[PDB]
Each structure stands twice: as structure tokens, then as C-alpha cells.
RNA sequence: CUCUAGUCUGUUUAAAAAGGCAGGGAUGAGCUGUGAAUAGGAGUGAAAGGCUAAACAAACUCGGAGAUAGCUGGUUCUCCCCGAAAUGGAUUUAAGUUCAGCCUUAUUUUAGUUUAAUAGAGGUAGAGCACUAAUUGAGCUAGGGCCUGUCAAAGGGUACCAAACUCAGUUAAACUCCGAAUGCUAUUAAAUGAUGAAUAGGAGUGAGACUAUGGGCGAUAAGGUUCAUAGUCGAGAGGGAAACAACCCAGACCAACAGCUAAGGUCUCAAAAAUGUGUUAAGUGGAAAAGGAGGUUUAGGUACGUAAACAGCCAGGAGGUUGGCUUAGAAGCAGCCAUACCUUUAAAGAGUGCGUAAUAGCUCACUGGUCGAGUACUUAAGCGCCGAUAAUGUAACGGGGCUAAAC
RNA sequence: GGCGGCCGUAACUAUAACGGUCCUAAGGUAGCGAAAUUCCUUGUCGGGUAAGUUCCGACCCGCACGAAUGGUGUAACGAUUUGGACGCUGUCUCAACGUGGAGCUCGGUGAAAUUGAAGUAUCGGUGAAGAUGCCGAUUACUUGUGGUUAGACGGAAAGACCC
RNA sequence: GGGUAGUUUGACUGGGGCGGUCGCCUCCUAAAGAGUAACGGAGGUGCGCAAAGGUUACCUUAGAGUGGUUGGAAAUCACUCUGUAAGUGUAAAGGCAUAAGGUAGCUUAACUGUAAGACUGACAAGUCGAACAGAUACGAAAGUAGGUCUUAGUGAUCUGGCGGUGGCAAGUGGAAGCGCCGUCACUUAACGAAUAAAAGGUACUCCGGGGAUAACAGGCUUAUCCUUCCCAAGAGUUCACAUCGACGGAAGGGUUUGGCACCUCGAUGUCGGCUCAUCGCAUCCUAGGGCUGGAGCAGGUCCUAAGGGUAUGGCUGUUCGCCAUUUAAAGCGGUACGCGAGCUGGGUUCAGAACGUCGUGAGACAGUUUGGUCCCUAUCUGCCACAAGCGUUGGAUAUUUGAGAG
């Protein structure tokens, strides 16, 4: 899995997440990027399963650079309890993604090839998405 | 039918359910009041023409300061700095007419 | 397993209590703070707990020198 | 003669504990008549908290007594004026009470409230990496081990384990070199007219609810729970949302068989619309997701074309060459590798699929002729399609119906 | 009134006669044991049955038996509890007919709890979240009698449970 | 000295109990003045110091790099860069270069009487404060000092003890005693402190109330559960999709275990069985199909289809499940987990008694065993049947078409 190593506090409070992305939102370090089309958390298990699906297309090509790191912990009171004592635990991490969130970043293959990986990644993601060329470079 | 949608749509119903003339006649009371406004250092007559009943603390308050208090009511007022301000506060509640 | 913590003190009520431009006669506390957030200038003193007060009346105005602000009395 | 297991009737009963079938004891710790004795914190008790006048975990009558209740219920004629609160603090307090806050009456006082202009203090939203932490990919390189002229001397090959540093790129309520909008405070000028304040008399309230935003907890579940701002209900009638305290419009002094309008509507039930330009074929309208999609309107890209594109039709669709092989076979179609493998080249790919142990065999990309303009892949929007899915009865337009009477 | 733990150990595997150790006032002997005690559990095996969570006979891993709050048995006894068998049967397959008192009709006498009243239908909804009374629609001549209890959150007892 | 008597035995609490908590201080939540809740998220605290206080004067860390007896990554020394990241008794925050940090000298202001004016505030309280008289400490002096860089280290009243003062002194003079000033004794911690002095059981229970508050149902929600669907790595001799589909993704159903506490505690009777059913289709059988890695027989998967049917017994209170025989099949669910003003009372959930466990005990146990009253004549709607009256346009008597319904 994908998770920070150590933490400050364990536990922290579910924001509203809203409006689109200013920021990690152009194609840097690749060709083909996933952006996003919508605002919502993106688990780090989710997250490695697209990683496998995307790395296990490419026979080799290139390379594929993850631009989004969870380190959210997502709590859960224990299954058959009340609603008392406080802020049960950690069960799983997520990520914070808005709509224009890269999300996601390949390089080497020819763009027919990375379009269908990127599909296939993109089937295992809970937002919609788009994949883009540099729409600057071909 | 689950009871948090049937709500959700009914309001969304009610909301989506207004009508484009009455729509334009408030677009074309809007456009009049601040080409008004725009002006300076002119006697314009106030109308009141929407209730205070339900509108927010703040506004009410400046309404009671420009003298109006039920609709229909009439008064007329220098336009300087204060009553152009208080006028913009309270622009979608009134209606100017110019006291040549 | 009950919380482990839910520990709260008072709350002080600091900030400044009167306004830049404001009118104070002499004595008058200006600023409640814990440290020197708001530093001396002419004519007004120090607390031991640095509170901020007026020597004489006249019209409090804050001051900003090298990015630290200074209340005065004129 | 005495008691009552089992069962039934009875159960507003014939009976405030019986009756019909029956059952147990019946020479004894037996049954029974007539007197007498033991009295309420006491009696008696082969012991069930049983019984002591049909009521016993402390009888009955009278008296204290009109006991005490922070609890429940009730509290009787009319009109006029003003008009809450369900918050804060404390509490052997949490369904109580008290002070403040909010109300009213009387007197005195005059200065709330909203703007505009000028001038002030924040650290929130947002943003940022300069601090504290988290973190992505390269570059670099200590240090650690691996390997090697090895002893453990000084060494060298570094796939790595990787500090620091450089470039690029991210995360944060308890990070901030930065930083608004509103809100808050002071002054002045206008505008509004008793809405402010002081003293005194009398209170009530201290169970709130939903809606629109910002949050915490929960499972970005609840008509959930707990806070902040405003509104309404509460304490508010009237019109609209088919019905529907909290939503929308709007504050009911009384009367009129007058008019103009707000929300919401104008085929009909049911008071009120017609014309203009398009869209929709699903009754969509008149519920909803991931996803699929030669539905269609409009606009725009990339391929491709009157020097013949696409679909069809007629041909070739090969030779070197079983590409070298792995394998047993692999002859284009188990599988490895590329196919920088060439030629005749019109065009023929180390072959698109079907199918053969292995081919063989049938097809396609590929290109030529007949035909004769848009086609083939995509992008953004306006409406649509499927996904669509519970139990009394059509039942997810209020009904009839509507192709507009829908958008 | 009380009557313990942990660890290691044999010509497979298993267990541990045995040994060590800590602690206590002392650490459960005889006998009994999935029991009126055994949670896991319908433990495991055998008997009974075509089929047995009950029953009987054992095994012992006794959550949480145990020696006058007696332990283990016992002839006889029991309107006690439990399992099996014979006989017998309307208990049942499966109900039918007949008999007596009510019920039904008429005459005489004549209550009751209950009751805001009432030209009190159904469905899909709505609503203090289960509607005779509200909305839309459907259905229905007026009024009695003999039957039946689905509803009127029916009647009865200021809920005994909970706070 | 429970033989007897009078009493106490807290509250908050997403019902109560169990557990946890109760005062004060720091930060976040807190939405840029102040304030603002929860059994929301992280910590501290019931002190320490005769200097670690006051004042005067003088100095500046930590880290990285670099050169060095042991000495190493890191001790002490020197330089460069960096410029407070170090250090401030003690948590955190706000501050701290003029340093509030480090060192040294002297010293006791860790003072008496006061205090304009304020902050915060229901009240009680708490906090800051220039300046003035007395008398010191340091300094040449100006000046600073009424403890500690700041904010926690605390406790009302009553009662009593100790020292001082000499005000009150029951006829007078004294005195006991009291008052005044200084000051000591409370895990009164449940920390605004009901007493100087206080634990449990009730299923033998009783009373006043509450749907302000739980258990059974209805309602909201769908975590869990169930039913599908999207992606297709693969398995399947090759062949993703005959079939299975992991890893993830999107929904519906309201049946399971739960969440909430909105209706009902001046009563909505709780599990099964019996009787009687009615409805949904997510179809167990019969019927119609598509594809199969479907030869045939027999299946597998999917689609359409609710007309009818869908077993008798053994064990258990059981629903459920297992088992024995059958059968074309032995469907899954809603309806107050259908149906007690229709029935049964085996189970659960009263008072008897017994076993094991817990408690010194009274007793307790979603541990077990045994015994243990199931009330009501139908007013209304509804339903099954049968009549009286009238209508159907003159009034009657036979025979029938048929909407519609079973």
C-alpha cells in the first residue's frame, strides 16, 4: 500500500471538499495524464489498484508517475456500537482530488496504447475522468 | 419512495418552477433602478414593492431607515452618498421613479 | 473506552480593546495580550503582564516599524 | 366424613374462589361440635412473605390531618394598548429554582439604528513552502551492507539500503514569508422618528423545532446529535406548493355584490393566453448512478476526396520463406524474439480472423477496375434511449387527457 | 468459611507416572461427572427409532461436582418430573350423524360495561411518521334481521416492564 | 450491641446500569473583535526557587562545514557560512536581539498606608494601573523594584488555635469573653463547598409521573445484510466474456444485526404452533425460448412468464436446521417478524422450590430445572347470507339480451 510512514496526529476532521483545482493541475513529468472531472476522495487502495492495471498494460513502454499521495486517515466507529464515546479509529487512507486534479501521468508508449491503459485505470476510479494529450504538444 | 429524495425534489420542482416573463420584468425593474442610481444630487421618489416579512435583519433595518415600512409607501429623498448606499443595499426591494 | 481527553480553560477575552482613532483618558487599557504583540510608543505603559494602558488622554493610533506594530497615544 | 392433583365449564359468573367428571387420606401427625387463651413492630406460623373478620413485606377505627408533593389535573364575564422566552452563569442541579438577558407600567433623560467618507486591530477563506511535519520523479552523494587484488592493514565493482543538497511537482484544524470579502470599533454628515438609557413596581421564561449558509461528531447516513448567522413556526390568519405548523408570497381594526397586483398560474375539472423561431418521438415532460450507445439539432477539429475518397461488386492479396526458432510439430495464425526481411513491387503484414496434432484450407489489412460525394474517427453544447428494480388497487403529471395542452 | 498456577519429560504419534519453579493458612482425598450443575454443545461413542437437540449406558477437555449448606447408593413408597413398550381408543388421517340445555320466532318481565356528538365507504397518498372525517380518484338505492370479529391504535384496570 | 429505631447511599449520560468524567491552565474545533457546545481532537496541573527574586554592568546561542592527544557521527578548542532554527525551572501558546537568554558584583521592593482610571463580568469574585506619603535595595545619575517573560500550582462562610492592639466590659473597679489587625488548621477534589458525623437489596413491592426515556411494533437511515450491475487480469488444450470471474468501481431492495428516539406507558399484549388466508416476483415445479466446452439422455447460464400447484414424519418450545422416506416441486418474501375482542400457553416475562456461579449478607445471573387463572352478550365501518320499502314515468304477469362480477 501507499501511506505516510509517521503522523503527527492520528485522527483529523472531515472537511468539505469543494471547487475545482488551482494547483497540480497541468501535465508535468509525461505524456498522457488522468485528469479528473469531478471533486471526491480517492483511497490509497483504489489508488494502487489503477497503478497495477495501468503498469501491468504497458509490456515495458515507459513509465508511470502517481500524483496523488492519501495521507488522510478515514475513521470508523467499531461495527454494533452507539454513538458515544468519540472518534473511533483509522481504518483506511484517502486521497483529496478536484475536478482538474492530474491524478495520474505516463510516458513512453504511443498515445493509442496509453489511451487504452488509461481507460483501463480509469475503470477502477470512483470520479469521472479525462484523459488528455499536452493538448500544447501533438 | 425514500422521504430525503421525495423533499429534494419536491423543493428542486418548486425552485425550477418560475416563469421567464416574470423573470425578465424583474430584470428590467433591476436595470432601471441602477441607471437611477447612477445618477447624483437628484430628488427621486422610493416605492416599496416587496414585503419585509421574512428578508434579513440587516436589510429591514436599512428599509426602517429610509422611512418605508409597508408596501405602497411613498417618499422622496436626496441622492447623496448615504442614500445611494442605502438604495444599492436595498435595490432588488424598491422602485425609483425621478421627481422632475 | 470512553475519551481519553475534553479539557477546556477559560477563555481571557484579550484583543484590543479601544479602537486606532479612539478617544482614552488617562489609565485606560488599550490592549490585553500574553507577550508584546503590540509594543510601546510615546505615552502609554507597560503592564507586568504586558497589557497595553494610556499615561495621558488623547487618541490612540497604531504605528508599523520593521513589520512590528507599536500603539502610541496623540 | 374430610381435603383438591389432573381436566372441563364458569370468567359484565348460580358462587367476591364454586360446579360437573374425578382424585388423595380414611384407627390416626385423623375429622368435627361447644367454650376459653395468645393483638399490630405484636400474635401465630410441619415455614408459603402464609394467616390475624372477603384487603397484610406490619390489620382496622378515630385523632394529629385540610400531613407533605420540584408530579398530574382543574381554575368561571367582556373590550382596548403593548408584548416575550425556551439563552448565559450557578446549583445534591439536568422535568426545579435563582441572577443576568428578553417584556410591561410610571417618571426622568436624549441618543440607539442604518449607511457613506476617512482611519484602525486580525489571520479565516484562499494561497504558499519561507518554519514545523507529510510526500512524487529525476540529478547528486555521504553513510550501511553486497561483490571484487579480500585477513580484520590501506583497498577497489556499486543493481541497491539511503542522509544532506539541486531542479521540477504536491498535503495540513492543532504548518504560515503572505492574505481578502463580510463582520467589529471610533469620528463626522445626512437619513429614519421614540426603536436608546437611568430609577422604581409587576412578571413570565430558562424542554424548542425546521429552512438557507459555515462547521464538529456520525458512515461528507438519518425528520440524527451538538454550535454560529438570519428567517419562519412557536405566538400568524390569508394566497400558492393536489392534501402538507418551519418552504414561496404576504402581517388579519370592522364593513362594501369596487379596482390594481405578489407568489403561483392561464385546454378541462378550475377563476386566467395568444402569437414568433427552434428542439423533443421517449408521454421524455410526469424520479436517480457507474457504464453502454451509427437517436437527433447546432457548432468545431483531425483524417480523405471529382487528379476518384468510403460501402458494395470483379481481381490480385505473392516469391525468397517451414522468418530463425523454443517444441515433437509451430509451414502466417501453442509460445520466445523483430517484422533496421529483402525483392517482383500496382500491393501483399515475420499476416486480421476462422480452422487444422503439424501444415493443409478458407478470409482480411494491402492494391487494381465498375460506380459516383461527402465519408471515417472525434470535441463541445440543446433535448432524448437503455441501465430503471416489490408486496390492498392504475399509484414517480392531483385527475381527465395533452405531440403541445412539452422544453 | 477456604481447598493454586506455569514449564519440561518415555524404543512412532499421542498424552505425562515423573521433575523443576512461584505462591498460600492449606491447595479437592474417597466417590461422582455434558449432571435439577457443561457456556462452547445437537461434545464424542454405544443402545433404542425407517429417521431421536429429549432419554439410557460410557468417555473426562469438571466454563463453574464434591464429602453433615452432607458425598455416593438404596428395598418400599409418590394425584412429583422424564423416556420407552403392550393394550385401548374420533387425539389424529377426516370428519359425519343423533341427544340435552342455550341460540332463532312470539308473549311477559327486563340489565350491563360504554358513549363529544354521526346525512361513520374503498384505494393510492398526505399528516404527530398506521386516516370513516384531509387530497385526487374509484365504488355505493333507502332501512332492518341472522351470523363473523379485520379495523374503530375496541372495552376493562391514572402500565405492573423501563426511567 | 442490625436485638431494635431514625436515615443516608450524587449528577452528567444519544434509556438506565457498567466504564469514564467533575476544579484550574494552553492550543484546535471557533466560521480573521469578544464570546460560543458535544462522552469532539492533543497536553498539563494541586509546584519549584533565599535565588531560579530585585538592581547595575558586561556578553550571545543551536546547526552545518572545516583543522585537531586519546576523541569515535556527536564532548572541549579555533575559523567560515547561516542569523534565533538555540535557550527561557515546569505543558502548550503568545512573546523574547535593546534580549525576557548567558555571566558577575551588591542586595531583600518576596515593603507599610493608599490609589485616579479601567478590563472582564448574573452575582460573589478575578485582573491591570500611572501617581502620592513613609522607609529601603541598586545606580554617578536619570530611574527601576509592591516576587518570578506572561497566562495554571487552588478553597467561600461558620467554628477553633496563635501574636498584637486596648474598642466593647450585664451596679462600680477588674476579669472571663468578644471585637479589631496580623495569621494558622478542610483531596470541603462531587473542588460556588445540602451534616461536625452516612453503604446496599427488592422478582414481595407500593405511590406520584413520563412516550421529556428504554424493551415489542410503525417511521427516518442503509453501516451491516440481500439482489444485481460496471472494469476483465486470468482459469478454461489455443479461446477475457460456454462457465467461473479475483483486485477494485456504481446502485437498488428495506428482509438481517444495528443507528435515531418522531407516534403510543389515565396499556399499541411479546416468540412459535393451529385455523384462515391475500399480495409481490428477485420462478421451486409445470409452459415458451437464446447460447453452450449442448451427440443422445441428463444438465449449466440467461431471458419471458405469478394460471395452478408447491409432502408426510423423527428430534427440539422452537422459526430455523439436520435426518428418514416420498414427490413434477417440496420456492423466496411483505402483510403490527399476517392472524390471541378466532384458538392453544410449550417458550419468554411475576410471586414457590432446587443446582452452578457472583456477593460477608439481603439477593443477583439474555445460566439451567420444575410448578404456575389467556377476560369481554358487536354500537359503527368491513365481510358472509336473507328480507321489508320504493324507484325504473299507466299498472301488472311470464320468457330472456347482456354491461359488470365471481
Redesign the pocket.
Known amino acids: 500500500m501507499?501511506?505516510?510512514?509517521?503522523?503527527?496526529?492520528?485522527?483529523?476532521?472531515?472537511?468539505?471538499?469543494?471547487?475545482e483545482?488551482?494547483?497540480?493541475?497541468?501535465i508535468?513529468?509525461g505524456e498522457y495524464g488522468l485528469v479528473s472531472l469531478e471533486?471526491?476522495?480517492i483511497?490509497a487502495?483504489?489508488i494502487?489498484?489503477?497503478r497495477?492495471?495501468m503498469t501491468?498494460?504497458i509490456?515495458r513502454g515507459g513509465?508511470v508517475?502517481?500524483?496523488?499521495?492519501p495521507?488522510?486517515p478515514?475513521?470508523?466507529?467499531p461495527?454494533?456500537?452507539?454513538?458515544?464515546?468519540?472518534?473511533?479509529g483509522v481504518?483506511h487512507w484517502n486521497?483529496?482530488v478536484?475536478l482538474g486534479?492530474?491524478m495520474f501521468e505516463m510516458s513512453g508508449v504511443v498515445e493509442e496504447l496509453a489511451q487504452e491503459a488509461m481507460?483501463?485505470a480509469?475503470?477502477?476510479?470512483?470520479?469521472?475522468?479525462?484523459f488528455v494529450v499536452r493538448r500544447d504538444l501533438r | 419512495?425514500?422521504?430525503?429524495?421525495?423533499?429534494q425534489?419536491?423543493?428542486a420542482?418548486?425552485?425550477?418552477?418560475?416563469?421567464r416573463?416574470?423573470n425578465k420584468?424583474?430584470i428590467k425593474r433591476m436595470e432601471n433602478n441602477r441607471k437611477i442610481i447612477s445618477k447624483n444630487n437628484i430628488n427621486v421618489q422610493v416605492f416599496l414593492?416587496?414585503?419585509?416579512?421574512?428578508?434579513?435583519?440587516?436589510?429591514?433595518?436599512?428599509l426602517?431607515?429610509?422611512?418605508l415600512?409597508?408596501?405602497?409607501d411613498k417618499?422622496?429623498?436626496?441622492l447623496?452618498?448615504?442614500?445611494?448606499?442605502?438604495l444599492?443595499?436595498?435595490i432588488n426591494?424598491i422602485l425609483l421613479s425621478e421627481v422632475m | 473506552?470512553?475519551?481519553?481527553?475534553?479539557?477546556?480553560?477559560?477563555?481571557?477575552?484579550?484583543?484590543?480593546?479601544?479602537?486606532?482613532?479612539?478617544?482614552?483618558?488617562?489609565?485606560?487599557?488599550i490592549?490585553?495580550?500574553?507577550?508584546?504583540?503590540?509594543?510601546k510608543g510615546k505615552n502609554v505603559?507597560?503592564?507586568?503582564?504586558?497589557?497595553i494602558?494610556?499615561?495621558?488622554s488623547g487618541?490612540?493610533?497604531?504605528?508599523?516599524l520593521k513589520?512590528?506594530?507599536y500603539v502610541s497615544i496623540v
Open positions: 501507499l501511506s505516510p510512514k509517521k503522523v503527527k496526529y492520528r485522527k483529523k476532521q472531515r472537511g468539505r471538499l469543494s471547487g483545482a488551482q494547483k497540480g493541475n497541468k508535468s513529468f471533486t471526491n476522495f483511497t487502495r483504489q494502487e489498484a489503477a497495477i492495471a501491468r498494460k509490456k513509465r508517475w502517481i500524483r496523488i499521495f495521507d488522510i478515514y475513521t470508523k466507529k461495527a454494533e456500537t452507539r454513538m458515544g464515546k468519540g472518534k473511533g481504518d486521497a483529496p478536484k486534479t492530474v481507460s483501463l480509469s475503470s477502477k476510479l470512483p470520479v469521472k475522468t479525462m | 419512495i425514500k422521504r430525503k429524495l421525495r423533499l425534489l419536491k423543493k420542482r418548486f425552485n425550477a418552477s418560475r416563469s416573463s416574470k420584468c424583474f414593492v416587496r414585503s419585509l416579512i421574512g428578508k434579513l435583519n440587516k436589510k429591514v433595518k436599512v426602517k431607515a429610509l422611512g415600512n409597508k408596501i405602497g417618499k422622496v429623498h436626496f447623496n452618498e448615504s442614500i445611494k448606499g442605502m444599492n443595499e436595498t426591494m | 473506552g470512553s475519551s481519553k481527553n475534553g479539557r477546556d480553560s477559560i477563555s481571557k477575552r484579550l484583543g484590543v480593546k479601544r479602537s486606532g482613532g479612539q478617544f482614552v483618558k488617562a489609565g485606560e487599557i490592549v490585553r495580550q500574553r507577550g508584546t504583540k503590540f509594543h505603559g507597560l503592564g507586568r503582564d504586558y497589557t494602558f494610556a499615561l495621558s487618541k490612540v493610533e497604531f504605528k508599523t513589520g512590528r506594530k
